[PDB]
Coordinates of N, CA and C (backbone and C1' of nucleotides) in Angstrom, one line a residue:
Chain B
X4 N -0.3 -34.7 39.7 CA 0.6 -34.5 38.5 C 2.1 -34.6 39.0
X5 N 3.1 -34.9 38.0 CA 4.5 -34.9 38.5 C 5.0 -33.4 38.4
X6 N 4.8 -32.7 39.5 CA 4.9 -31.5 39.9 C 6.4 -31.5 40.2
X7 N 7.1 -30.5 39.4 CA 8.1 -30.4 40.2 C 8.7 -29.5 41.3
X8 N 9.7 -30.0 42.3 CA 10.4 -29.9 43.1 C 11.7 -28.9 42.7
X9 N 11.7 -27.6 43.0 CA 12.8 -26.8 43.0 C 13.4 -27.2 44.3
X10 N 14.8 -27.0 44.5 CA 15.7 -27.7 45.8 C 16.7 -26.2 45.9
X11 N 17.2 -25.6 47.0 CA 18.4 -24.7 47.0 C 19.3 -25.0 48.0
X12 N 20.6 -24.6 48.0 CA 21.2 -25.4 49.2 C 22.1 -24.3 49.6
X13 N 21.7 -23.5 51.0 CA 22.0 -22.8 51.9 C 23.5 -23.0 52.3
X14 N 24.2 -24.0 52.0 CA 25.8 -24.2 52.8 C 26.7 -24.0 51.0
X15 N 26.1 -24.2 49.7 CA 27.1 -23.6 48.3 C 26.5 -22.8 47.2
X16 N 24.8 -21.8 47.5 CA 24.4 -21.2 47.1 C 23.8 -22.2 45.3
X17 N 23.9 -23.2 45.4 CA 23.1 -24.6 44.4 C 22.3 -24.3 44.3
X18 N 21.4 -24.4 43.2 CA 19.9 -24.7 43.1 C 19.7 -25.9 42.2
X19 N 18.5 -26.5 42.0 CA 18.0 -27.6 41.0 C 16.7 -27.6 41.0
X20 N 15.9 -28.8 40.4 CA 14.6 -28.8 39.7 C 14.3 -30.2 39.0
X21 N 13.4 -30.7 40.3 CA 13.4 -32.5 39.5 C 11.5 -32.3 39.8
X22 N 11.4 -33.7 39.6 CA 10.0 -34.1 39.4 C 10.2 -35.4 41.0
X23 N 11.2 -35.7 41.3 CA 11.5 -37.0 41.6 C 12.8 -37.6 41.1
X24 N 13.3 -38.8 41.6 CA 14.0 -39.8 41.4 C 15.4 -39.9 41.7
X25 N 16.4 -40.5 41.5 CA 17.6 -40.3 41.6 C 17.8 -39.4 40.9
X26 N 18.6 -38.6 41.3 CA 19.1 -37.2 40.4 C 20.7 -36.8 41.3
X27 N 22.0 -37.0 40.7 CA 23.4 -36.4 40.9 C 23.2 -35.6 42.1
X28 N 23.1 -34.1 41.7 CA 23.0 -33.5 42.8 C 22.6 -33.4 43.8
X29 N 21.2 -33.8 43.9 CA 20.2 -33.7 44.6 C 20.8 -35.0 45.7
X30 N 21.2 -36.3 44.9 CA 21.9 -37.2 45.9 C 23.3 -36.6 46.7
X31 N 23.5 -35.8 46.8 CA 25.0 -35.4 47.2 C 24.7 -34.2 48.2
X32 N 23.5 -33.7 48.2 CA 22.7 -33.4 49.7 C 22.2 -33.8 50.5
X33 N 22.0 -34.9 50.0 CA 21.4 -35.8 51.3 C 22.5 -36.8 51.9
X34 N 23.4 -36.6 51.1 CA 24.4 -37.6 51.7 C 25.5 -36.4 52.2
X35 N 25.5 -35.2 52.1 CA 26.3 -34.2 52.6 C 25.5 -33.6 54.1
X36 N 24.1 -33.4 54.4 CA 23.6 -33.1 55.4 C 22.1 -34.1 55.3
X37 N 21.3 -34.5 54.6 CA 20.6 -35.1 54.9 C 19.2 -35.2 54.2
X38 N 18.9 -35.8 53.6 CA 17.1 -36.0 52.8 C 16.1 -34.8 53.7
X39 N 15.8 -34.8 55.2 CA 14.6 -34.0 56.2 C 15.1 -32.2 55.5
X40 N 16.5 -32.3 55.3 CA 16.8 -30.8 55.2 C 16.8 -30.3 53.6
X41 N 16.9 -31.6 53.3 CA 17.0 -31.3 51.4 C 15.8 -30.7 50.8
X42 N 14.9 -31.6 51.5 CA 13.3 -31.5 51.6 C 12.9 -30.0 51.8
X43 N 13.3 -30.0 53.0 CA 12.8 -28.6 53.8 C 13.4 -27.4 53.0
X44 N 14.2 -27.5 52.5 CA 15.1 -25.9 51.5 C 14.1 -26.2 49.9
X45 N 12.8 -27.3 50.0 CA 12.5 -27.0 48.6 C 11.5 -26.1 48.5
X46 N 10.9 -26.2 47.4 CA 9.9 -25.1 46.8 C 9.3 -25.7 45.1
X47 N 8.0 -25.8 45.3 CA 7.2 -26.3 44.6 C 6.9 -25.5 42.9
X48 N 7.3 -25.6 42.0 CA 6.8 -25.6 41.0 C 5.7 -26.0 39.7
X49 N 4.9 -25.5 39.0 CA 3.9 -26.2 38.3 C 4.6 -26.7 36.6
X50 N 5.3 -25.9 36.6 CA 6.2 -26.2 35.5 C 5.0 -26.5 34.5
Chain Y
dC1 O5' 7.3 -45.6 56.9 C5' 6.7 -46.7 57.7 C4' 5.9 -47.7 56.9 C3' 6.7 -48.3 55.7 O3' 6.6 -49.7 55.8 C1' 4.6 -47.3 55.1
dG2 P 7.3 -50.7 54.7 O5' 6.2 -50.9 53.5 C5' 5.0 -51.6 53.7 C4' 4.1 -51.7 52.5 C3' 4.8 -52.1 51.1 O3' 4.2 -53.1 50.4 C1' 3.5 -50.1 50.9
dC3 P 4.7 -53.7 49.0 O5' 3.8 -52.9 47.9 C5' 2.3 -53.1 47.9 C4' 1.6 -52.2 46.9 C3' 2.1 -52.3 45.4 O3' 1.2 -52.9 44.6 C1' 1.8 -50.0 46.2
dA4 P 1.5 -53.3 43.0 O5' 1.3 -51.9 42.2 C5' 0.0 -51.2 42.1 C4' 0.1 -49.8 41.5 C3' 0.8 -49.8 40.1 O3' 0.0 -49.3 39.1 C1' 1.4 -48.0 41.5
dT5 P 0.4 -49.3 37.5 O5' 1.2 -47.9 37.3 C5' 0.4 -46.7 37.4 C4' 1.3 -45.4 37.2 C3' 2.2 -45.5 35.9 O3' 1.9 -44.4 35.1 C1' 3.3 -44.8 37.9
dA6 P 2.8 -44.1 33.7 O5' 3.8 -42.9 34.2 C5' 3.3 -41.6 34.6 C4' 4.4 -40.6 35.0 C3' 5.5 -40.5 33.9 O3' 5.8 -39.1 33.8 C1' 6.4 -41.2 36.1
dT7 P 7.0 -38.5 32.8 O5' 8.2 -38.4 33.8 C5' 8.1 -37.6 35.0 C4' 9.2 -37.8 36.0 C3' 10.6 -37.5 35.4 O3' 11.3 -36.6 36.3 C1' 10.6 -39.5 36.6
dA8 P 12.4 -35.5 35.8 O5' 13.8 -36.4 35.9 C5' 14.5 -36.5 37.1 C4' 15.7 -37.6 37.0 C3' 16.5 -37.5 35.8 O3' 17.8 -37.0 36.0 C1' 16.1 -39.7 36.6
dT9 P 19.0 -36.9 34.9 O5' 20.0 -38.1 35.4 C5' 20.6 -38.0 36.7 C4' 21.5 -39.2 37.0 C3' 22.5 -39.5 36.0 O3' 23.8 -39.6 36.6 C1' 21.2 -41.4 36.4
dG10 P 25.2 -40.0 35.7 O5' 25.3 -41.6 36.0 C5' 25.5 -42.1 37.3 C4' 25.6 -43.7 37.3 C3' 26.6 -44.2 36.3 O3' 27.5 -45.2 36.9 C1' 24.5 -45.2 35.9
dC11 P 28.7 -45.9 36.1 O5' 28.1 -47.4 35.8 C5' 27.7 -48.3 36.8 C4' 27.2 -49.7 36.4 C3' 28.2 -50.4 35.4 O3' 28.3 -51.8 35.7 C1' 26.0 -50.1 34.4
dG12 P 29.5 -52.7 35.0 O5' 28.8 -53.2 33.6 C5' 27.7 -54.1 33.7 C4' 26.9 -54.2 32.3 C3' 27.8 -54.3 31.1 O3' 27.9 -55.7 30.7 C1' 25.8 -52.9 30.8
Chain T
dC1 O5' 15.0 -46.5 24.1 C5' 15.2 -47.6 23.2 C4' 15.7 -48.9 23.9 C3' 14.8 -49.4 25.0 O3' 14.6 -50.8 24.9 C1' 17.0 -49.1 25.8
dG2 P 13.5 -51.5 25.9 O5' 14.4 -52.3 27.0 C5' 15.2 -53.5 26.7 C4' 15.8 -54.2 27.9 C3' 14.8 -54.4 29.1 O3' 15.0 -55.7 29.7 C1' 16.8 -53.1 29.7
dC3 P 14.1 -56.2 30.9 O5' 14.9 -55.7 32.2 C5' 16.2 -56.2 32.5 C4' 17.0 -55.3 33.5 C3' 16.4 -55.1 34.9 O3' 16.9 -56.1 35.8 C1' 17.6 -53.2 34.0
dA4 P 16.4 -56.2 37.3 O5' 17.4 -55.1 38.1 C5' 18.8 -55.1 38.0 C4' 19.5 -54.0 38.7 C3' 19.0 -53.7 40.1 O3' 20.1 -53.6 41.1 C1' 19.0 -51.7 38.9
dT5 P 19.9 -53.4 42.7 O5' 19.7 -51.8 42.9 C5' 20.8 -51.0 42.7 C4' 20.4 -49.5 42.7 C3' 19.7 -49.1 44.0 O3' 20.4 -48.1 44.7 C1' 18.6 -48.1 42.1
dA6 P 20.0 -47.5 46.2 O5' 19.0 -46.3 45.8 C5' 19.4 -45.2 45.0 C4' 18.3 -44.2 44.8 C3' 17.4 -43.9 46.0 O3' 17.6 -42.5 46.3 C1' 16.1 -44.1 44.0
dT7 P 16.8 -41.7 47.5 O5' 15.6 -41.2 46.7 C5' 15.8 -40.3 45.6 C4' 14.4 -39.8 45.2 C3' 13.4 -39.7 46.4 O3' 12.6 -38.6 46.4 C1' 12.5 -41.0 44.7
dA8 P 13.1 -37.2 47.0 O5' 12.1 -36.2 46.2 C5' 10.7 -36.3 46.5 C4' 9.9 -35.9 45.3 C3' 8.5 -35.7 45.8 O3' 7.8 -34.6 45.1 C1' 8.6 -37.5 44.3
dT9 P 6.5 -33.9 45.7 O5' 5.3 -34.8 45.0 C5' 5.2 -34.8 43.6 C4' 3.9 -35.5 43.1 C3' 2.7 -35.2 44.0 O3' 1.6 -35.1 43.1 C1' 3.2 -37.5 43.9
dG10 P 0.2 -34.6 43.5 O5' -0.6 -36.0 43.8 C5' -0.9 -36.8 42.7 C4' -1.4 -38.2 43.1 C3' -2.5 -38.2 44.2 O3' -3.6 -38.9 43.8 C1' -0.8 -39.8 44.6
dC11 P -5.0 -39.0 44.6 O5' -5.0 -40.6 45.0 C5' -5.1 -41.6 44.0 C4' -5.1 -43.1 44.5 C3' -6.2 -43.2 45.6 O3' -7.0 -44.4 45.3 C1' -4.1 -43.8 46.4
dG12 P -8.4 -44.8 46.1 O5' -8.0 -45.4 47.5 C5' -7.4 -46.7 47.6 C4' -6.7 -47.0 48.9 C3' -7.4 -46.6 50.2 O3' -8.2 -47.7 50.7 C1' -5.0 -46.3 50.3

DNA sequence: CGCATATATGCG
DNA sequence: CGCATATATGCG
């Protein structure tokens, strides 16, 4: 299923909630420290 | 990693 | 909304 991905980001206290895809925020973590760590601060939802 | 499908924002 | 760009989940 398209399960979503809760994200939090330990360096501006952020959080978010995608399924996937290009998404604003979520791109501006990975380009601020990196996709392996964006990943790793997530947490699984069944939404 | 590559393909397929659903998701997700921006250009037009 | 059509398309480009990107990206999770799932098949293999």
């Amino acid at each position: 299923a398209r399960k979503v991905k809760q994200y939090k980001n330990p360096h501006t206290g952020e959080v978010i909630e995608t399924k996937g895809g290009n998404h604003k925020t979520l791109k501006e973590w990975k380009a601020k420290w990196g996709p392996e760590a964006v990943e790793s601060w997530a947490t699984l939802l069944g939404h």
